[PDB]
Write an enzyme that holds these catalytic residues in place. Structure first.
Site, PDB file in Angstrom:
ATOM      1  N   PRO A   1     -18.357  85.944  31.968  1.00 47.44           N
ATOM      2  CA  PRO A   1     -18.680  84.503  32.045  1.00 47.44           C
ATOM      3  C   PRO A   1     -17.462  83.577  32.146  1.00 47.44           C
ATOM      4  CG  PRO A   1     -19.190  85.353  29.869  1.00 47.44           C
ATOM      5  CD  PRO A   1     -19.062  86.545  30.823  1.00 47.44           C
ATOM      6  N   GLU A   2     -17.684  82.422  32.771  1.00 48.11           N
ATOM      7  CA  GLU A   2     -16.648  81.403  32.955  1.00 48.11           C
ATOM      8  C   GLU A   2     -16.544  80.595  31.666  1.00 48.11           C
ATOM      9  OE1 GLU A   2     -15.953  82.538  36.983  1.00 48.11           O
ATOM     10  OE2 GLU A   2     -14.788  81.420  35.507  1.00 48.11           O
ATOM     11  N   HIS A  92     -24.674 100.948  27.744  1.00 48.40           N
ATOM     12  CA  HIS A  92     -23.306 100.442  27.785  1.00 48.40           C
ATOM     13  C   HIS A  92     -22.914  99.595  26.577  1.00 48.40           C
ATOM     14  CE1 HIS A  92     -23.493 101.959  31.818  1.00 48.40           C
ATOM     15  NE2 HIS A  92     -24.402 101.068  32.172  1.00 48.40           N
ATOM     16  N   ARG A 111     -18.881  97.319  32.747  1.00 45.73           N
ATOM     17  CA  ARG A 111     -17.502  97.522  33.174  1.00 45.73           C
ATOM     18  C   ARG A 111     -16.587  98.001  32.036  1.00 45.73           C
ATOM     19  NH1 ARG A 111     -18.898  96.725  37.569  1.00 45.73           N
ATOM     20  NH2 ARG A 111     -18.337  98.920  37.863  1.00 45.73           N
TER      21      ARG A 111
END
Ligand SMILES: [Zn+2]
Length: 254
Positions: A1-2, A92, A111
């Site tokens: 997220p930004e 994950h 990721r």
DNA sequence: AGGTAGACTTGGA
DNA sequence: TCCAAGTCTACC
């Protein structure tokens, strides 16, 4: 997220964990933990501590406990969730903080690219990764003057400058290319080549690009190579600048 | 000694 | 095979 999203996460997460006491810390991927070096030390020191607050510095979240502060970065694909210890974990899931009320704070990331650091509260700000972090972009501390000082002092591109966390906090590849397009500035331009009027204009679009995001979609150039520019119709182009994919309109930006 | 490259990670083009 | 992402640590 930004950055805007990390702020929303901060606001949303706080009431869901404030006042809860850590009873266990489970780690399924030790390398997420960067400090202390031993993930077992990380886990052990947090047990027994109660969550007292949650702050944001750039894109890092700073969980405030009793003695310690947990500094965590989700980067782009990481995510948190608060749920019951009685239910199966999402795929994950790499780190789980278990509270005494049977609930859990969970970090998951397809990721597995996030990082976590824990230090006594009073030391967090002078240790990595918070050490050297530039001013908050939506704060008085980030000004045209600050931007100009760093600009006329380096040989790097204007893009490389904006990507620098020590210059200003929070600008990743996307907001950098978007900000430059809105300011009418080519990303490969040397930072020093920028005129005073250009610095002022860039500071303005950076703040707008950051603020507007939160109190694809709405993108002018990022990932739109080969498509018409929304302001002039010229096909957006993509190149490599500062070692990163870079998008810009050759007519709107100079 | 600013500034660049390497390291981290792995679903997809 | 190799790019993406953000932010460190390793060194010309
Ligand atoms: Zn254009």
């Amino acid at each position: 997220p930004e950055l805007p999203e990390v702020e929303t996460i901060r606001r949303t997460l706080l009431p869901l964990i404030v006042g809860k006491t850590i009873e266990d810390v489970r780690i399924f991927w030790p390398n997420i933990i960067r400090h202390p070096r031993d993930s077992e030390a990380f886990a052990a020191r947090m047990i027994g501590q109660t969550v007292r607050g949650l702050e944001r510095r750039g894109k890092f979240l700073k969980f405030l406990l009793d003695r310690d502060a947990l500094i965590s970065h989700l980067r782009m694909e990481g995510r948190y969730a608060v749920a019951s210890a009685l239910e199966p974990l999402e795929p994950h899931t790499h780190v789980v903080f278990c509270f005494t009320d049977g609930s859990e704070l969970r970090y998951r990331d397809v990721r597995k690219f996030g990082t976590m650091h824990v230090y006594a509260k009073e030391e967090a700000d002078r240790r990595p990764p918070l050490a050297e972090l530039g001013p908050e972009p939506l704060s008085p501390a980030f000004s045209p003057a600050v931007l100009a000082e760093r600009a006329v002092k380096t040989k790097r591109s204007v893009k490389a400058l904006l990507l620098d966390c020590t210059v200003v906090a929070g600008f990743g590849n996307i907001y950098v290319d978007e900000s430059l397009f809105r300011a009418g500035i080519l990303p490969g331009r040397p930072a020093a080549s920028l005129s005073s009027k250009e610095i002022e204009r860039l500071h303005e679009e950076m703040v707008a690009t950051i603020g507007e995001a939160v109190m694809q979609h709405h993108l002018y150039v990022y990932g739109r190579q080969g498509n018409p520019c929304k302001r002039c119709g010229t096909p957006i182009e993509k190149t490599v600048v500062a070692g990163r994919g870079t998008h810009y309109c050759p007519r709107c930006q100079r």
